Amino acid sequence: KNIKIMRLVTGEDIIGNISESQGLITIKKAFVIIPMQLVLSPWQPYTDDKEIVIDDSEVITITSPKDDIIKSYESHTRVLENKQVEEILRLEKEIEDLQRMKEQQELSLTEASLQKLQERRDQ
Amino acid sequence: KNIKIMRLVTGEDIIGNISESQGLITIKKAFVIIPMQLVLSPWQPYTDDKEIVIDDSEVITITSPKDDIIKSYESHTRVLENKQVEEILRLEKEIEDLQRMKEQQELSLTEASLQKLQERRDQ
Amino acid sequence: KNIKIMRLVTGEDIIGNISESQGLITIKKAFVIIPMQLVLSPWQPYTDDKEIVIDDSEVITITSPKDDIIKSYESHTRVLENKQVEEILRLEKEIEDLQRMKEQQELSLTEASLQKLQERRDQ
Amino acid sequence: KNIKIMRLVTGEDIIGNISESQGLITIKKAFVIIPMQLVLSPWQPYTDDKEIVIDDSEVITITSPKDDIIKSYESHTRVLENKQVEEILRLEKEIEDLQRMKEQQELSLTEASLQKLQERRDQ
Ligand SMILES: [Ba+2]
Ligand SMILES: [Ba+2]
Ligand SMILES: [Ba+2]
Ligand SMILES: [Ba+2]
């Protein structure tokens, strides 16, 4: 584990897990720090990739942060995971309930209705 | 000691102690100069590192400043240290007073209460 | 254990743990009973001594109380201990947090600033 | 030195230096504690005696106090002495100034006026 803040050539502050292998660096769980206490936002809200590879030629400064920001970052990154798991449980329960109710509703049906059901499902 | 102002590719003015060793330069006690008299702000308010290493390919101009800005910078950099030391003394005194008062409060206690204290502290 | 209410020559009612050895009696956890349900107050709010020794020549009547007052006295004397322990935990946690924050704040300092810190602490 | 609070048969709280020799006790710098923070008042504001001798048959409880009251008592008993010394200096300076001014005023006088002065002073 290695948490190091950095400043991008664009002019923004990125905090996350860093790995510098061969110049090009790998970033995990990156967060944009908005100056405003502190506010953190997702860096790449359009991708699900765990790691993002960038080039060291496009980063200005890489430095270790103070402990308060470390605590805030850890708290935020565990709250997000907890909420994600809670939503997964909610979705699974709703899916199970809907499937059971649909099964019971479909159970009471006639033969011709079942044939029409199959035909329209095929269509 | 070597104080030289510089202009970054972003378009900001940085004043601080500079050391140019092998192209990449080391900066200590950097300050952003805001055009407004003069106003100075911390450059990296999220890190406690004494020195920051940047690349000469990302700096436009490095030049020595006039004496008025030198005087203002020295005054500001000593005022900050003085205030830091004063706050350290304040915190130490408050901690000592709180510890002493807690010790006297805990002194007056019963055996069963002491056992409950130890159990809940262990929990 | 022996709980016996008594009436003082002053004209007040004291309830607490009693021990009559050689005329002079020892009282622990004494409480003044205010006639108003029942209201209890500390008897000696300026001392931390567990036991107080008084003379039997200065007490009018010593008698055992009814069960309702015993229950109220026990409830009050456990609530006070519980609140005392809770406040001890609060104070310890606050002291630990303040000490940790002061340590991190002092960690980031310069040599001359450290020397000034030591000199002013000595003063 | 021995500071012990006590409760009198009258029903008041006395704090001061105590000495128990032969039953009868000696009290120095006694203060009445008024329940209201804490407020202290002189016990015997009509006498200048340093020590007052009372009988143990007229005191209910004698117990050691907590540290906060000790600190307050010491602070008050040094402030009173400091103010007393300051007033002594004020009075001495005023007396010296008045004596000097009277001496200079009396210096310029005639022989018959001096004789009348002596006669009326004798009267
Ligand atoms: Ba770089
Ligand atoms: Ba250049
Ligand atoms: Ba009796
Ligand atoms: Ba007595």
Name every residue whose Cβ is closer than 8 Å to that of residue A5 and which is 6 or more positions away in sequence.
A13, A14, A15, A33, A62, A63, A64, A65, A69, B46, B47
Q: How far is CA B113 from CA B69, B118, B123, C75, D121, in A?
A: 63, 9, 15, 15, 80
**Beta strand spans in chain A (E):** 5-8, 13-22, 24-34, 39-42, 51-54, 59-63
d(CA A66, CA C105): 10
Q: Which of B78, D82, B46 is nearest to A37 (CA)?
A: B46
d(CA A73, CA A16): 8
Q: What are phi and psi of D108, to 5 degrees?
A: -85, 95
Start-to-end Cα distance in chain D: 54
- Judged by DSSP in three states, D8 sits in strand
User: What tokens does B44 get?
Assistant: 């990296």
Question: Which one-letter amino acid corresponds to residue D4?
Answer: K
Is chain D adjacent to chain A, meaning 3+ CB pairs within 8 angstroms? Answer: no
With CB atoms and an 8 Å threshold, state whether C46 touches D9: no
Contact in structure between B83 and C116 (CB atoms under 8 Å)? no
List the chains bordering chain D where 3 or more Cβ pairs fall under 8 Å. C
Contact in structure between D4 and D31 (CB atoms under 8 Å)? no
Name every residue whose Cβ is closer than 8 Å to that of residue D12 and which is 6 or more positions away in sequence.
D32, D33
Q: How far is CA D9 from CA A36, B42, C8, C54, in A?
A: 66, 68, 10, 12
Q: What's the length of chain C? A: 123
Q: How far is A78 from chain C (nearest CA, A)?
A: 22
Name every residue whose Cβ is closer than 8 Å to that of residue A44 and which is 6 or more positions away in sequence.
A30, A52
d(CA C17, CA C31): 10
The alpha carbon of A16 and the centre of ligand 1 are apart by a number of angstroms equal to 17
Contact in structure between D31 and D13 (CB atoms under 8 Å)? no
Contact in structure between B17 and B3 (CB atoms under 8 Å)? yes
| CA angle, A58 then A59 then A61, to 5° | 160
Start-to-end Cα distance in chain C: 54
Contact in structure between C26 and C53 (CB atoms under 8 Å)? yes
d(CA C70, CA C65): 7
Q: Which of C80, C81, C77, C73 is nearest to C4 (CA)?
A: C73
d(CA C45, CA D18): 20
Where b means 16+ CB within 10 Å and e means fewer, A89-116 reads: eeeeeeeeeeeeeeeeeeeeeeeeeeee
Name every residue whose Cβ is closer than 8 Å to that of residue D53 and which is 6 or more positions away in sequence.
D24, D25, D26, D27
Name every residue whose Cβ is closer than 8 Å to that of residue C104 and which is 6 or more positions away in sequence.
A66, A67
Q: Which of C79, C31, C73 is nearest to C52 (CA)?
A: C31
Which H helix or E strand runs over B63? Answer: strand B59-63
Where b means 16+ CB within 10 Å and e means fewer, B62-88 reads: eeeeeeeeeebbeeeeeeebeebbeeb
Determine if residue D25 is left, alpha or beta; phi over 0 gives left, psi from -120 to 50 gives alpha, anything else beta: beta
d(CA B39, CA B76): 10
β-sheet bridge partners, residue A66: none
CA A27: distance to chain centroid?
Answer: 14
Q: What are phi and psi of B11, to 5 degrees?
A: 115, 30
The alpha carbon of D32 and the centre of ligand 3 are apart by a number of angstroms equal to 28
HSE-up of residue A47 (Cα within 13 Å, Cβ side): 10
- Which of C89, C99, C120 minimises the CB distance to B95? C99
Residue for token pair 């660096």: A25
Residue C40: burial class (beta carbons within 10 Å; 0-12, 13-18, 19+): middle
| Experimental resolution (Å) | 4.0
CA A99: distance to chain centroid?
Answer: 27
Neighbours of C73 (CB within 10 A): 20
What is the DSSP code string of C20-41? EEESEEEEEEEEEEE----EEE
Q: Which of B22, B29, D108 is nearest to C112 (CA)?
A: B29
Residue A61: burial class (beta carbons within 10 Å; 0-12, 13-18, 19+): buried
Q: Which residues surround ligand 4, an ion (CB under 5 A)?
A: C 55
Contact in structure between D68 and D37 (CB atoms under 8 Å)? no
Handedness of CA C94, C97, C100, C101 (dihedral sign): negative
Question: Which one-letter amino acid corresponds to residue B57?
Answer: S
Which H helix or E strand runs over D14? Answer: strand D13-22
d(CA D9, CA C8): 10
Q: Which of A105, B35, B99 is nearest to A113 (CA)?
A: A105
From chain A, which residues contact B within 8 Å (Cβ)?
A: 5, 7, 9, 11, 13, 33, 60-61, 63-66, 69
β-sheet bridge partners, residue D31: D15, D42
User: What tokens does C37 get?
Assistant: 């349900």
Q: Which of A7, C117, A77 is nearest to B45 (CA)?
A: A7
Q: Which of C104, B47, C100 is nearest to A69 (CA)?
A: B47
From chain B, which residues contact C within 8 Å (Cβ)?
A: 48, 50, 81, 84-85, 87-89, 91-92, 94-95, 98-99, 101-102, 105-110, 113, 116-117, 120-121
**What are the helix (H) ranges across chain D?**
67-107, 111-122
β-sheet bridge partners, residue B32: B14, B41
What is the DSSP code string of A73-91? HHHHHHHHHHHHHHHHHHH
Q: Which of A47, A36, A43, A38 is nearest to A17 (CA)?
A: A43
Neighbours of D29 (CB within 10 A): 17
